Nucleic acid binder design. Sequence first.
RNA 1: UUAAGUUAGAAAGGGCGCACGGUGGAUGCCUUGGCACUAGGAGCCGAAGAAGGACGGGACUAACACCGAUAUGCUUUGGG
Length: 59
Amino acid sequence: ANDIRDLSTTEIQDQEKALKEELFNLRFQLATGQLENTARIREVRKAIARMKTIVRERE
RNA sequence: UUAAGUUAGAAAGGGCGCACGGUGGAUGCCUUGGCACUAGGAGCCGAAGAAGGACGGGACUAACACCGAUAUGCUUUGGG
């Protein structure tokens, strides 16, 4: 969370994209019954929310 | 033996009493909820989009509660 604040906005924006790609893949593996560590999904969702919160704070 | 006479007993089923069960949810005890007030506070919300909703959000989610595509939560300050 503080580590996110060390990054630039553009750098944060890139981290979001990466997390959204990850979240999509998790949901895809979950659907095909190949996930196992199902707790990752919640982690990633929160992370994305954290990014978007920091960015909105910047403005 | 015959005759005359007398009287018993009987239960297909039923009645009364008793015993033991079933059904049913009265009664007692209990209280998650109510009822009436007192003292203080507060007496408005809305185009900066209200009241009230609909549909969604969880690993799996039918319902409730919570939340809004940042969705079963995000940041921060304190408490613990």
